[PDB]
Design a binder for this molecule. Structure first.
Ligand SMILES: Cc1cccc(CC(=O)N2CCC[C@H](C(N)=O)C2)c1
Ligand SMILES: [Zn+2]
Length: 139
């Protein structure tokens, strides 16, 4: 679990969005596993606007942060799950690092701010949904 709170927006994994997220929907994209909902309170986070390929992510299944080298956002095949049919997920960045299903929502940060959230993983990989291209989150 986890979310990014920026301005009057909440960014979550689309597959973990709540009834309240859907009732306050701003934007969603199944191909990216992202959903953004509106909030009444001002957020605590800021978004990176950069091309970093290193950063640190929070891993809830270890209660720890780990450093990672990750690929640029790309279109990657993701096998069928209870949440989606087999498909290509876009804007996904892969890295070597521990992750388990409940780690989705963990934030990846670089020195410039929030880069993205854990969305996929397994077998010593961790995949992050990028948010750096969503310029409207800032205004
Ligand atoms: C973080 C992690 C580690 C091991 C396993 C998993 C599960 C996983 O990859 N799924 C299920 C949920 C939706 C995901 C998606 N973005 O399509 C795919 C997730
Ligand atoms: Zn950066």
């Amino acid at each position: 679990s986890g979310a990014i709170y920026v301005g009057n927006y909440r960014v979550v994994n689309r597959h973990l969005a709540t009834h309240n997220d859907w009732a306050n929907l701003v934007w969603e994209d199944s191909s990216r596993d992202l959903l953004v909902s509106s909030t009444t309170a001002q957020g605590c986070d800021t978004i990176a606007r950069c091309d970093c390929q290193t950063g640190v992510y929070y891993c809830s299944s270890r209660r720890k942060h780990y450093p990672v080298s990750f690929s640029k956002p790309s279109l990657i095949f993701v096998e069928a799950s209870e949440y989606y049919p087999a498909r290509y997920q876009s804007h996904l960045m892969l890295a070597v690092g521990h992750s388990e299903p409940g780690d989705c929502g963990g934030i990846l940060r670089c020195q410039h701010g929030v880069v993205g959230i854990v969305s996929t993983g397994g077998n010593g990989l961790v995949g992050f949904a990028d948010v750096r291209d969503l310029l409207w989150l800032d205004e």
